[PDB]
Amino acid sequence: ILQHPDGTVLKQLQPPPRGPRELEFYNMVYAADCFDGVLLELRKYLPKYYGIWSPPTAPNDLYLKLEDVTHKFNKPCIMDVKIGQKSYDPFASSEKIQQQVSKYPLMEEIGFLVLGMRVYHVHSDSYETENQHYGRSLTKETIKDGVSRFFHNGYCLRKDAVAASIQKIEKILQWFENQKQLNFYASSLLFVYEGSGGEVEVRMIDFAHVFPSNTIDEGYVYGLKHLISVLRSILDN
Numbered sequence: 035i036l037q038h039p040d041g042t043v044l045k046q047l048q049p050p051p052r053g054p055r056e057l058e059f060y061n062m063v064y065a066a067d068c069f070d071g072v073l074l075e076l077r078k079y080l081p082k083y084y085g086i087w088s089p090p091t092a093p094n095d096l097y098l099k100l101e102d103v104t105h106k107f108n109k110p111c112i113m114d115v116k117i118g119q120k121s122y123d124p125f126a127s128s129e130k131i132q133q134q135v136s137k138y139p140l141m142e143e144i145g146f147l148v149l150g151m152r153v154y155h156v157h158s159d160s161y162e163t164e165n166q167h168y169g170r171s172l173t174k175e176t177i178k179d180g181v182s183r184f185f186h187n188g189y190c191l192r193k194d195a196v197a198a199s200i201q202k203i204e205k206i207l208q209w210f211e212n213q214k215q216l217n218f219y220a221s222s223l224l225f226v227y228e229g230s231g232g233e234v235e236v237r238m239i240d241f242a243h244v245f246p247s248n249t250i251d252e253g254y255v256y257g258l259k260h261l262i263s264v265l266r267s268i269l270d271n
């Protein structure tokens with residue numbers, strides 16, 4: 035992710051077929067002539083999309099120009115959570131299924147995976163960062179405390195940010211409860227709160243494996259609900 039001079043970011047297209055599929059998704063959702071109510075509502079939960087972008091001298095080098103969802107924050111605390119029971123898509127080969135499940139074999143049970151976090155600490159005026167191996171090490175026994183860490187600043191557990199996150203996720207859940215046209219695999223939620231009350235951003239990202247469907251995205255719904263349940267239990271701390 036590159037931070038373009040505008041309060042925007044540039045996300046470089048992943049290699050094919052993943053990057054092209056993500057481009058296609060953003061193009062479908064943000065089509066100027068789109069009046070599908072489902073897709074118009076979905077726009078609220080994505081970064082705003084400004085189209086494909088390439089450097090002036092490098093039309094080969096493809097990016098998505100996207101809203102910087104952290105722009106309104108001073109000291110943003112950011113967590114990326116992959117959502118769903120399966121991180122492989124409906125056309126994955128046996129090898130690919132195994133590759134994806136082996137990255138985190140608890141995906142079916144938990145329904146989400148923390149990809150990373152960056153937490154501002156007041157006491158030290160510095161960031162603690164957790165990488166991909168952090169969330170991949172979390173089990174049913176440790177997922178609550180693992181998620182809790184995101185909301186620990188210098189002095190307190192940020193239950194305000196926890197409650198706001200639940201409230202924002204519930205709107206996304208409601209969108210999923212009311213559509214049967216898209217299924218999302220290996221997609222994520224980006225959580226942002228202010229680390230420097232109740233002010234949170236939750237946006238859906240990572241759309242290289244979104245497929246047309248005729249069913250409720252049940253794995254995504256499972257994950258959102260379990261994530262809501264974990265966050266809710268954290269409010270009892």
Ligand SMILES: O=c1c(O)c(-c2ccc(O)c(O)c2)oc2cc(O)cc(O)c12
Pocket residue numbers: 035043045081100101102103104105112114150152224239240
């Ligand atoms: O707006 C975005 C953003 O700010 C970040 C970001 C910033 C700082 C971090 O430390 C981090 O992990 C992610 O990622 C993104 C990823 C997307 O796919 C789309 C986006 O719009 C953003």
